[PDB]
Design a protein around this ligand. Sequence first.
Ligand SMILES: O=C(O)CCC(=O)C(=O)O
Ligand code: NI
Ligand SMILES: [Zn+2]
Lengths: 330, 10
Amino acid sequence: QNPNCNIMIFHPTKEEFNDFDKYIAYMESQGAHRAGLAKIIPPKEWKARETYDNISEILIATPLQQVASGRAGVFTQYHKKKKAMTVGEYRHLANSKKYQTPPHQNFEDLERKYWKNRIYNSPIYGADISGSLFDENTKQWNLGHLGTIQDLLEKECGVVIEGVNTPYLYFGMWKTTFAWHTEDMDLYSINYLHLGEPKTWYVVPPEHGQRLERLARELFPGSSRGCGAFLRHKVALISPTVLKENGIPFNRITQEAGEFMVTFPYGYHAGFNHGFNCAEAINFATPRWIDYGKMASQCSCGEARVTFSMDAFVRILQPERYDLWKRGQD
Amino acid sequence: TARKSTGGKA
Ligand SMILES: O=C(O)CCC(=O)C(=O)O
Ligand code: NI
Ligand SMILES: [Zn+2]
């Protein structure tokens, strides 16, 4: 199923939107995970929140300026902290002459402009904000309350890691960027675009993830000095042209406001925002993730320090393999 | 304390 690893798009009914884990399993039964990314369009009647009329006063404590260096589709990006500003102030800044989406004729044109001009006018991203815009009354696909087996991390081990098992908000503007990465511990992620302009995603099928890692070693000198998990640093930007020239299989898709994207374990992804927007995202897990969690690379230089023990997950959800697993641990 | 991050600093 899904032999070509196409990004699949799902349209669950209201009845199918009641049980998150069940629907994820269904998607995988149709081969969705092979692409590394899927889109879920919610039932017509569903809404995340009644209104967004009163979000302009939210304070973005630490907006980040995203400074890219490089050329010809290959860049490194680093972040500079900027002064706090409200979402209202941020929206005004996003829409200002310096930062507004350039005039363009179509997606392909905007995409070319993104890659060609990435070093100019470093954009400001209101990223990694602890919080949620889902109404408490929204009981289906509420990112604050998905009820997956990832809940063991807090329940069993008392571990809370912001953004992993608590939700993040992202206020974006044109050119704001997520670099190539898998999730910490190779978890799934889910991302809901609440409002505003689109978000474009690139994804390499998990089966080809190692080829992306090899390419990153070829493109980024010194990337392995002192660390075996460079891409966990989330500093590498690599254009689709460069992926194509180097034979790395990938796909692209644009997420619109009101749509969910799910990334699957070890599905490398990267992308960018088209203009002012607001997304919310969180990690989650399933039983199928456990063996990925066991295998996940870990940064060994202190740059990317999100990690946790797999013990509780194997102990509780893989009881018949727990002794075998422990033997491999020592 | 470790938390999910969009990228790297400095
Ligand atoms: O929207 C963003 O900047 C984060 C996208 C992402 O990497 C994810 O949701 O896993
Ligand atoms: Ni991600
Ligand atoms: Zn490292």
